[PDB]
Write a protein that binds this ligand. Structure first.
Ligand SMILES: CCN(CC)[C@@H](C)CNC(=O)c1cc(-c2cnn3ccc(-c4cccs4)nc23)nc(N2CC(O)C2)c1
Length: 290
């Protein structure tokens, strides 16, 4: 607290807040994720050091950029370069024109961030809309993957039981079966996110969490009419490759970047405005706040 001035709250985590801050000598603005100590558990300092270590490692145009890590008695401070564009999903629902080409561009940037994690031995484990930020429209509006509080370090392509973590709507079948897992769990979540980007509601849902899990473990998603009839088959195909329940057969981020809907978007992705997706996304966002 000797070096930064804190300003307004930007968002909330389970045991954290993110506030805009300024380094008092330089006048430079940043964002500080401030992790509280309400909950104390066995390996606290190992978890905090891991999050900082993973954040220090990852330097990519589509990943948040760590500046400093500061340990205090009651709080821990992870200081990042500030991005001012807000959450991706809140940006989309404010658009007046939003098409498959726009979803494809978003997913491509997400895929670049996820591929960069995996090449560096990092599994994020908590890919979800609220962890996707935006650089300012004045700065190019690059998608920024954020919050590595749940992320793990893996040795190459070796897989193991790394614990139960993540967000229910985005959990992978291998995690719900308590099977060993790894990098593919992020491509599963990427597939859930892509589905929502196209029609504005999730592929797996039930107010009963037990039935939600049963649906994920079955991998039983579909493309109902009429809203999916206007979606290109190539977009559906990419979802199919990400949402296969055998993680061995799931497309990797490096492969997904070569999918025609991603890398030939001007000729493969539809340019039709999807106003129903905007309408449903607004509801989707509002429910997740409550
Ligand atoms: C992302 C995870 N959060 C829970 C912790 C979600 C659930 C809630 N939202 C926010 O935390 C949020 C964050 C930021 C923000 C701006 N620079 N920056 C730089 C680094 C980081 C982070 C690094 C590691 C974790 S966050 N975050 C930011 N800007 C926001 N917005 C809304 C307003 O329009 C500007 C909202």
């Amino acid at each position: 607290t000797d070096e930064y001035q804190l300003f307004e709250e930007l968002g909330k985590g389970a045991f954290s807040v993110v506030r805009r801050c300024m380094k008092i000598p330089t006048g430079q603005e940043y964002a500080a994720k401030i992790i509280n100590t309400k909950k104390l558990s066995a390996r606290d300092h190992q978890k905090l050091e891991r999050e900082a270590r993973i954040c220090r490692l990852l330097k990519h145009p589509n990943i948040v950029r760590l500046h400093d890590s500061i340990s205090e008695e009651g709080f821990h401070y992870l200081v990042f370069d500030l991005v001012t564009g807000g959450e991706l999903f809140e940006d989309i629902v404010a658009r007046e024109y939003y098409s498959e080409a726009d979803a494809s561009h978003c997913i491509q940037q997400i895929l670049e961030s996820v591929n960069h994690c995996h090449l560096n031995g990092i599994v994020h484990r908590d890919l979800k809309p609220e962890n996707l930020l935006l650089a300012s429209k004045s700065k190019g509006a690059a998608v920024k993957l954020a919050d590595f509080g749940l992320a793990i370090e893996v040795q190459g392509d070796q897989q193991a039981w790394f614990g139960f973590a993540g967000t229910p709507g985005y959990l992978s079948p291998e995690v719900l079966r308590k099977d060993p897992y790894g990098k593919p769990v992020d491509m599963w979540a990427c597939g859930v996110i892509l589905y929502i980007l196209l029609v504005g509601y999730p592929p797996f849902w039930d107010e009963d969490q037990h039935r939600l899990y049963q649906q994920i473990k079955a991998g039983a998603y579909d493309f109902p009419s009429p809203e999916w009839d206007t979606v290109t088959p190539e977009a559906k195909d990419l979802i199919n490759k990400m949402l296969t329940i055998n993680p061995a057969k799931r497309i990797t981020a490096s492969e997904a970047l070569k999918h025609p809907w991603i890398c030939q978007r001007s000729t493969v992705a539809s340019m039709m405005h999807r106003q129903e997706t905007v309408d449903c996304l607004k509801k989707f966002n509002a429910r997740r706040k409550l």
